Write a protein that binds this DNA or RNA. Structure first.
Ligand SMILES: [Mg+2]
Ligand SMILES: [Mg+2]
Ligand SMILES: [Mg+2]
Ligand SMILES: [Mg+2]
Ligand SMILES: [Mg+2]
Ligand SMILES: [Mg+2]
Ligand SMILES: [Mg+2]
Ligand SMILES: [Mg+2]
Ligand SMILES: [Mg+2]
Ligand SMILES: [Mg+2]
Ligand SMILES: [Mg+2]
Ligand SMILES: [Mg+2]
Ligand SMILES: [Mg+2]
Ligand SMILES: [Mg+2]
Ligand SMILES: [Mg+2]
Ligand SMILES: [Mg+2]
Ligand SMILES: [Mg+2]
Ligand SMILES: [Mg+2]
Ligand SMILES: [Mg+2]
Lengths: 140, 196, 97, 105, 51, 287, 121, 95
RNA sequence: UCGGAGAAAAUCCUCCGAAUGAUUAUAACCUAGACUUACAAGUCAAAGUAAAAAUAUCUUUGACCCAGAUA
RNA sequence: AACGAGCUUGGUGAUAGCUGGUUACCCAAAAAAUGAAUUUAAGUUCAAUUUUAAACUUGCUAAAAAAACAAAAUCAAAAA
RNA sequence: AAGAAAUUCGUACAUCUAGGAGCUAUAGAACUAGUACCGCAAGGGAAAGAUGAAAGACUAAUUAAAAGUAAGAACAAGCAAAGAUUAAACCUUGUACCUUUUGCAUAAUGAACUAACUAGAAAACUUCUAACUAAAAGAAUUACAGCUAGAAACCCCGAAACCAAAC
């Protein structure tokens, strides 16, 4: 045996250190531990993408709850705020709903205000002048 | 050159027995079928404890090869230049010394800012002075060789080179002969018109 | 895996022993000595591979050619079998035809 | 590895920037070998860059210890009590300078 | 017995880590530990706070 | 040389600072990692993957290409054909100009070999050197040269400048001694006789037009003049030439060296030549 | 057999109502095309794959400027279904060396030569 | 073939190649046409002429014949009066 | 095994033949460029030269080795 | 103590176009399973593909008329 | 597939008993032993040991350290984890590995687990790096820019059988 590997202790500990919080022989038996660690790492990597999407779903639910309190559906709240040139994102809208209820009510009133102008505008046929809150600030 | 000097002498005596050379192993251990075991034909196969080695060292092995004669001569010229340009070469008229005490030689090396190890070259082994022979005999890092013994590897191992004036002429003659020479019609040990 | 629980004794190497200090001397015996001797003549080793190199089949055949007539019966039988195995490997087996 | 590891919340040591900003790195130690190939880049760092780093950061105490050494090592200590150690073995001058700045920040 | 001094040396460091966990050392003031100069540290204290 | 000045600045060269020339070493790949491990480059399991594919030239069972072609005597008798190293007049002039061949003395295969102008391999069926016409236009040397074969144009160039060319036959044993005389001398044998040409080559070396060494001298003047008229030059009377004695020198058909008779022993060590006195031996060598 | 298709010429002969709908004059035709890839060439025949790379439309929703000349149009007709063709419009004229660095292509198809990022005022 | 021979440890020539093909030094190989001596009474005159010719070998065939012969057969031979003297070299070959 | 024909470039798809003879104005040698083709084998051919004073006309197959027959 | 032919050793590392296996990381490219011959169809050799390096110049898409066919591919001027 | 000879070369380290980019208890001899044990016989054929200067100092210590257990059974829900979370489990996401099968796994093989051992090897041509260059090579070889040297390569286990001599 001229040349025998002498570092196998540390190569084994590379895998087992990640497996110590498993249950069963997965947490201490290298042949089983290595297979489990590889699935845990694959799950972690794919969960990084999924985490962003799940957070957005949480925000939309929380925004729907907040807007429904004032009588507005989620699509009405979002689109009409956009039509007012307000670019607050869904993550920030949740922070305002939970921690700034008075400000969020103003946004609901603004969104409903713009929504009503749109209803009148469509029936207006274009002869009627544009709504006060329906004006767009141009940029160049 | 230095790698040639190290690797052309090398013979490794590492060996292992193949499955054919380990004691026993002739009979088939158990039948192919109706055993529930892995199939085997000998208890000395590489998979077994005590079996033969599949690809191990085989017998005495040699690493012999030869660098071209011009290449090996060119290496010595490069090594001599390196010692001179790096202020590690010291030309001396003769190796005569006042005393035979090895301490004197070591002290002189310190005084002149020579290295921890010194290589001393003399023209021929037979005529080398008695005083230097005694001094170098007991010194590990001061080594005395004749001119025919000069080589690249020893020059690298020793920090400073000491050449006598006659040795320098000897060295120039042999090395410069290598360029401006013909290829050999037959080995140079045989008589030639103008070669000693 | 299990590891030593103690440090092994330190290895002490004398780099200036006579063998290490004088390694390489007379490797230029030919060019610096008028070519009376070739440097290979300074190689110490088995009679059949002094100043020679080859693959294992060549080495086995060379040993038999040199000292085959002075070999023990066990050794010579093993050497001859090694030749036939290597002969079949090099001349019939491999990726490249 | 998230569930196999610890986590914490975003924080500062002592409300670091509310009133005035204080540099958390307070001590750097550099161990060198005078004559060793692996410590060459660290030796060049001391010759050229260590003095400038010390002047730029007057609140960090820098200790340079040339001594017989197999691997050069940088030890960084912070005000909160954390200690970080870095192997500098055979790194170029730029890498060591780049790493040293990261410890300060 | 596998060849090598290095693996033995590595595992010694692992042993030290385990020993510390089981029987943690009694805390010692930084003045006792190496790489300490009182005069320089005092000046750095002032410079740190911009005072 | 500024490069040597760079060495002055740098640290000492030693066994710890050595490096091979860049790109002088490729990497050896072992089948251990996933890239080159696994199937290890042998492909899927089969005859080739197990290492037992048929021999080179086997085409899967159909009659192979190298066997379906008829046998024909391209190389019949190849090892028994005589080969002549070609020496051109261009190369001969180059050697004379650089001093590697001495035009003052007669030129034989030994002189050409000594000056490295030609490389002879007797073991590889060389029977000597043939003069080759190439370079004839620019050849301007007066030379006495002995070759095994010669061409009409090559002979014309030699004679026009005032030199002499003869074609002589050396047997395989004689050729080796002529090419490398000194190794022969160290053996300690007496100089052997030179065998006459095989019956096939007798007509060639007994013909004046080829300047054969066994040809009739009386027929040389006619042959020499004929080339002069054919190739438009005036034949030079070489007897008047001061170096006529050297130019006229020719070896005896049974002599290998100019001044050494068959049967002598060359004692190089003591700088002596030993000659036999036994009558029967002298008859053998004189023959 | 799925094969390359030759469209009848009548498809590309417009009607008077078409000019009113899209607001393009049959005279003074526009010079440069704005073309964007809005579909994938996966699951499409290789000839459609080839032209998309020739036209530079490898990335989707990134506009490419092309010449409104018959040879280019022939290639565009091959991949007409995978792209959106919009006429390049120059309200303020061609960009000059001074304004070459201040341009911006609007979603309307207009290449403005002055881009300020300020309220119109 | 034999890559490492028992006695000398060398490659061995396939003599059936040496008995059928001629190697020109440039790297080309010559051969005869199969059947050029067979059943000539039923072959057309043009067919017989095609059979009589010496023909070159392809790159793969040349590569195979190179593997099946040793270096001795690839050397320069200076035969007096060689009839292939001119065909051992390539002229005006740009490629 | 190969050739002819339909489907029409698939088929265990459907047919006819060939391992030919007849016919003779006897049908050379040499040589550009091409076809066909895994390889092997198989096709067409200007120019030049030579016999004569229009080609052969109907319309296919077996390699290497090895044995024969001769001048 | 499993005889269509005992057992042991040796030849022997028998041979196996068959089953199984063939141990670090990173980067890049990638066929196709088509045609031909083979006691050949569980294999092999050649073509074809693919690939690395090098040389120097046109390639890919398209492609009018116009022929060849019968009354969407082959060919590929100019251009783009 | 096999394969000469003629003919050239070679005084081999010489001196005295030396040497290792050989193994270190599954290695290196099968070996602590041809023993124990197995077979009527020929024959086959193992395993293992570890204190200190002193045991005429009571036999040493050293190590979160393998699997396995114990200390400490479990608590709706699910390839056993991942995202997370104030929170271990609850909520959400998620059809074990290898090998093959057509690129397909709810297929079919193989794996109770731990430790150690356990499988790519050669230089004809080609490429890269250098020496010298119409010549290169330390004799025999190649050469119409070559020649010389270096570096770069082609696995493991497994039959039924066949033959010789013993029992
Ligand atoms: Mg999403
Ligand atoms: Mg055996
Ligand atoms: Mg047996
Ligand atoms: Mg077996
Ligand atoms: Mg063993
Ligand atoms: Mg030659
Ligand atoms: Mg062909
Ligand atoms: Mg004609
Ligand atoms: Mg029985
Ligand atoms: Mg086998
Ligand atoms: Mg098969
Ligand atoms: Mg058959
Ligand atoms: Mg074109
Ligand atoms: Mg043992
Ligand atoms: Mg044992
Ligand atoms: Mg445990
Ligand atoms: Mg659950
Ligand atoms: Mg089954
Ligand atoms: Mg390898």
């Amino acid at each position: 045996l001229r040349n025998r590997l002498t570092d196998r202790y540390w190569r084994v500990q590379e895998v087992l250190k990640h497996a110590q919080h498993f249950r069963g022989r997965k947490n201490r038996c290298y042949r089983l531990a290595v297979r489990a660690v590889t699935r845990a790492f694959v799950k972690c990597t794919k969960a990084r993408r999924l985490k962003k999407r799940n957070l957005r779903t949480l925000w939309i639910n929380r925004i729907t709850a907040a807007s429904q309190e004032h009588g507005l559906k989620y699509p009405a709240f979002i689109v009409n705020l956009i039509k007012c040139q307000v670019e607050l994102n869904r993550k920030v809208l949740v922070d305002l709903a939970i921690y700034e209820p008075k400000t969020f009510k103003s946004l609901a009133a603004l969104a409903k205000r713009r929504q009503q102008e749109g209803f009148a505008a469509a029936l207006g046929d274009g002869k009627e002048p544009e709504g006060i809150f329906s004006r767009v600030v141009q940029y160049h | 050159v230095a790698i040639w000097q190290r690797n052309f002498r090398r013979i490794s005596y590492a060996n292992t027995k193949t499955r054919a050379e380990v004691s026993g192993g002739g009979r088939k251990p158990w039948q192919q079928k109706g055993s529930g075991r892995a199939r085997h034909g000998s208890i000395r196969s590489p998979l077994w404890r005590g079996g033969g080695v599949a690809h191990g060292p085989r017998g005495p092995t040699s690493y012999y090869y030869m660098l071209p004669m011009k290449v090996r001569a060119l290496g010595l010229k490069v090594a001599l230049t390196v010692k001179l340009m790096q202020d590690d070469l010291h030309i001396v008229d003769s190796l005569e010394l006042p005393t035979a005490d090895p301490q004197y030689l070591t002290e002189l090396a310190q005084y002149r800012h020579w290295g921890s190890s010194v290589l001393l070259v003399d023209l021929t082994h037979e005529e080398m002075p008695k005083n230097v022979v005694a001094a170098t005999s007991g010194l590990n890092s001061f080594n005395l060789i004749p001119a025919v013994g000069l080589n690249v590897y020893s020059m690298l191992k020793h920090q400073t080179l000491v050449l006598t004036l006659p040795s320098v002429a000897f060295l120039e003659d042999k090395l410069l002969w290598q360029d401006s020479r013909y290829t050999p019609l037959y080995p140079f040990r045989l008589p030639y018109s103008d070669f000693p | 895996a299990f590891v030593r629980l103690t440090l092994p004794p330190p290895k002490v190497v004398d780099r200036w022993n006579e063998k290490r200090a004088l390694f390489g001397v007379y490797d230029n015996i030919g060019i610096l000595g008028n070519f009376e001797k070739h440097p290979k003549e300074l190689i110490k080793g088995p009679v059949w591979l002094r100043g020679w190199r080859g693959n294992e089949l060549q080495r086995c055949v060379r040993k038999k050619k040199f000292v085959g007539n002075r070999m023990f019966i066990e050794d010579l039988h093993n050497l001859n079998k090694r030749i036939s195995y290597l002969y079949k490997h090099f001349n019939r087996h491999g990726k490249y035809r | 590895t998230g569930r196999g590891t610890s986590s914490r919340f975003l924080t500062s040591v002592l409300h670091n920037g509310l009133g005035r900003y204080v540099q958390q790195l307070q001590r750097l130690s550099l161990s060198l070998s005078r004559d060793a190939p692996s410590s060459r880049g660290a030796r060049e760092f001391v010759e050229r860059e260590v003095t400038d780093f010390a002047r730029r950061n007057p609140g960090v105490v820098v200790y340079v210890n040339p001594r017989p050494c197999a691997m050069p090592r940088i030890v960084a200590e912070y005000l909160n009590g954390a200690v970080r150690e870095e192997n500098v073995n055979s790194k170029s001058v730029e890498e060591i300078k780049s790493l040293v700045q990261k410890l300060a920040d | 017995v596998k060849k090598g001094f290095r693996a033995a040396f590595r595992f010694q460091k692992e042993l030290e880590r385990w020993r510390l966990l089981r029987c943690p050392p009694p805390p010692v003031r930084r003045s006792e530990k190496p790489n300490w100069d009182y005069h320089a540290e005092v000046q750095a204290f002032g410079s740190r706070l911009q005072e | 040389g500024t490069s040597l000045d760079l060495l002055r600045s740098l640290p000492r060269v030693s066994l710890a600072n050595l490096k091979p020339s860049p790109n002088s070493r490729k990497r050896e790949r072992r089948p251990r990692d996933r890239r080159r491990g696994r199937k290890c480059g042998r492909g899927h399991k089969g005859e080739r993957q197990r290492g037992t594919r048929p021999r080179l030239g086997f085409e899967g069972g159909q009659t192979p290409f190298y066997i379906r072609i008829p046998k024909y005597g391209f190389n019949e008798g190849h090892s028994f054909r005589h080969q002549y190293q070609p020496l051109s007049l261009r190369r001969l002039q180059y050697l004379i100009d650089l001093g590697r061949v001495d035009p003052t003395q007669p030129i034989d295969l030994t002189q050409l070999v000594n000056g490295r102008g030609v490389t002879i391999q007797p073991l590889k069926r060389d029977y000597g050197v043939q003069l080759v016409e190439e370079g004839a236009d620019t050849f301007q040397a007066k030379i006495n040269i002995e070759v095994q074969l010669a061409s009409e144009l090559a002979i014309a160039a030699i004679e026009k400048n005032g030199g002499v060319v003869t074609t002589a036959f050396y047997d395989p044993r004689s050729l080796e001694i002529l090419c490398k005389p000194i190794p022969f001398f160290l053996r300690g044998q007496p100089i052997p006789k030179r065998m006459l040409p095989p019956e096939s080559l007798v007509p060639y070396y007994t013909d004046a037009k080829n300047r054969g060494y066994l040809a009739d001298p009386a027929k040389f003047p006619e042959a020499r003049l004929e080339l002069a008229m054919k190739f438009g030059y005036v034949l030079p009377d070489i007897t008047k030439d001061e170096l006529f004695r050297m130019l006229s020198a020719r070896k005896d058909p049974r002599q290998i060296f100019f001044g050494l008779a068959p049967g002598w022993v060359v004692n190089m060590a003591d700088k002596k030549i030993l000659k036999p006195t036994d009558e029967n031996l002298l008859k053998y060598y004189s023959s | 057999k799925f094969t390359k298709s030759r469209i009848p010429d009548k498809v590309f002969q417009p009607k008077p109502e078409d000019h009113e709908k899209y607001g393009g004059d049959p005279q003074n035709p526009h010079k440069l095309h704005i073309v964007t890839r809005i579909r994938s060439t996966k699951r499409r025949p290789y000839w459609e794959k080839d032209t998309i790379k020739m036209l530079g439309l490898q990335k989707a929703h990134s506009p490419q400027i092309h010449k409104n000349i018959p040879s280019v149009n022939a290639k565009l007709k091959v991949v007409k279904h995978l792209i959106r063709i919009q006429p390049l419009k120059l309200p303020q004229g061609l960009p000059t060396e001074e304004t070459m660095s201040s341009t911006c292509l609007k979603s309307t198809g207009e290449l403005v030569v002055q881009w300020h990022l300020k309220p119109v005022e | 073939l034999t890559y490492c021979s028992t006695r000398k440890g060398k490659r061995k020539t396939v003599k059936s190649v040496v008995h059928r093909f001629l190697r020109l030094h440039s790297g080309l190989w010559l051969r005869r046409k199969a059947g050029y001596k067979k059943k000539l009474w039923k072959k057309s005159t043009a067919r017989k002429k095609r059979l009589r010719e010496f023909v070159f070998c392809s790159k793969t065939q040349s590569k195979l014949l190179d593997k099946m012969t040793t270096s001795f057969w690839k050397r320069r031979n200076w035969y007096a009066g060689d009839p292939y003297q001119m065909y051992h070299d390539r002229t005006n070959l740009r490629v």
